[PDB]
From a paper:
Profilin is an ubiquitous cytoskeletal protein that interacts with several molecules, such as actin, proline-rich ligands, and phosphoinositides to perform several cellular functions. Profilin is also an important allergen present in pollen grains, food plants, and rubber tree, and it is considered a pan-allergen, because it is present in all eukaryotic cells and is therefore involved in allergic cross-reactions. In this work, we focus on the study of two plant pan-allergens, profilins from the rubber tree (rHev b 8) and maize (rZea m 12), in their monomeric and dimeric forms. Here we isolated the monomeric and dimeric species of the recombinant profilin allergens rHev b 8 and rZea m 12 and obtained their crystallographic 3D structures.
The rHev b 8 and rZea m 12 crystals (5 mg/mL) were obtained using the conditions described in the materials and methods section. These crystals diffracted to resolutions of 1.9 and 2.2 Å, respectively, and belonged to the P43212 space group. A backbone alignment of the two 3D-structures reveals that they adopt the same conformation, with a root-mean-square-deviation (rmsd) of 0.27 Å. The sequence alignment shows that the principal differences are between residues 37ANFPQFKSEEITGIMSDFH55for rHev b 8 and 37ENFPELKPEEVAGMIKDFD55 for rZea m 12. These residues are structurally located in a region exposed to the solvent, mainly in the loop that connects β-strand 2 and α-helix 2, but some also belong to α-helix 2. The electrostatic potential surfaces of both structures display the most significant differences that lead to a more electronegative surface on rZea m 12. In general, the most important structural differences between rHev b 8 and rZea m 12 are the contributions of some side-chains that alter the surface charge, essentially at the loop that has been considered important for antibody recognition 262728 and it is exposed on the surface of the dimer structure. The assays showed that mAb 2F5 specifically recognizes monomeric rHev b 8, even at a low concentration (2 μg/mL); conversely, mAb 2F5 showed no reactivity towards monomeric rZea m 12, suggesting that this IgE recognizes a conformational epitope on the surface of rHev b 8 that is not shared with rZea m 12. From the immunological standpoint, it is relevant to note that mAb 2F5 only recognized rHev b 8, but not rZea m 12, even though the sequence identity is 79.4% and the folding is very similar (rmsd of 0.27 Å for Cα).
Residue numbers in the entry: 0 to 131
Amino acid sequence: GMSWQAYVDDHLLCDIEGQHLSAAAIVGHDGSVWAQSENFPELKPEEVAGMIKDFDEPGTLAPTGLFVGGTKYMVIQGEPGVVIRGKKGTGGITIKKTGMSLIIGIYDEPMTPGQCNMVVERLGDYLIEQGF
C-alpha cells in the first residue's frame, strides 16, 4: 500500500523533463512532518504558521518574506488559498495546500519554476481528490 515517504520519493523527487527537485516534504497543517526528503530543512517555529496565515488571508507573507528552514524566499505570484510560491536566486519553492496537508517542493537551476510548480501542484490535486 502507499506511504507518505513513497509519495515524497517517487512522486515529488521523480524526474520531470530530466530535472529533479532539490528537496521536498509533505507536512500537516499543524507542522507535523508526514514525510520528507534527505536534504529537506528542519522547519523553524512559526514558518508553517506563516504559510497557513497566508493561505487564509492572501498577501500577508509578501512584505515579510517567505521563510522555510531558516531560508528566505521572495514571495512571487501564487494562487489565493491554494498555492504559495517563492524565489531565491536561480532556485525557489512551491507550497501547495491540501485538505489537511501542505506539499512543499524546493528546486534550483537548471530546474525551472514551471517544473517545480507542475510536480508539487499535480500531486496536491491528486491528494485532494483522495480526501487529504
